[PDB]
Write a protein that binds this ligand. Sequence first.
Ligand SMILES: [Mg+2]
Ligand SMILES: [Mg+2]
Ligand SMILES: [Mg+2]
Ligand SMILES: [Mg+2]
Ligand SMILES: [Mg+2]
Ligand SMILES: [Mg+2]
Ligand SMILES: [Mg+2]
Ligand SMILES: [Mg+2]
Ligand SMILES: [Mg+2]
Ligand SMILES: [Mg+2]
Ligand SMILES: [Mg+2]
Ligand SMILES: [Mg+2]
Ligand SMILES: [Mg+2]
Ligand SMILES: [Mg+2]
Ligand SMILES: [Mg+2]
Ligand SMILES: [Mg+2]
Length: 66
Amino acid sequence: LRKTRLAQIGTGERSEKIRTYNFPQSRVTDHRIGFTTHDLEGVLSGHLTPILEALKRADQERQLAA
RNA sequence: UGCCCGGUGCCGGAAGGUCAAGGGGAGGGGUGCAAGCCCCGAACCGAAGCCCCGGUGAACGGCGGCCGUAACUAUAACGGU
Ligand SMILES: [Mg+2]
Ligand SMILES: [Mg+2]
Ligand SMILES: [Mg+2]
Ligand SMILES: [Mg+2]
Ligand SMILES: [Mg+2]
Ligand SMILES: [Mg+2]
Ligand SMILES: [Mg+2]
Ligand SMILES: [Mg+2]
Ligand SMILES: [Mg+2]
Ligand SMILES: [Mg+2]
Ligand SMILES: [Mg+2]
Ligand SMILES: [Mg+2]
Ligand SMILES: [Mg+2]
Ligand SMILES: [Mg+2]
Ligand SMILES: [Mg+2]
Ligand SMILES: [Mg+2]
């Protein structure tokens, strides 16, 4: 349970970031897939289904052998 | 060579409370014609000891429980009771 958490949380530094929420520019970027939206008020309210599907896509595009 | 004198010890305290023999004798009782003889007896006075108020540990001795809380987990300097 510990080695697995540190595989996810790490040190918690500013880097190691997975997804930035920039309020001044109403932007929400997810750096693993190259996806950004601008519905920040909607993202921080629950409408995350866009980014998840966008993540699932690159995951299925990842599972391409060989 | 720390903290606890509530308990036991010892030390201190001419106040107060309790307190024995004794002092005292309100008031009774036995008997006798009686003078009387005999008995009981309340208040009150009346030590040490004990109570009571203090002190005291290189005197007898005693020196907690539960619950929470910090940049991963853990722990908990910290908080509550
Ligand atoms: Mg000692
Ligand atoms: Mg003591
Ligand atoms: Mg003592
Ligand atoms: Mg004492
Ligand atoms: Mg004394
Ligand atoms: Mg006598
Ligand atoms: Mg007497
Ligand atoms: Mg007498
Ligand atoms: Mg007498
Ligand atoms: Mg007569
Ligand atoms: Mg006395
Ligand atoms: Mg005593
Ligand atoms: Mg005492
Ligand atoms: Mg003791
Ligand atoms: Mg003992
Ligand atoms: Mg923690």
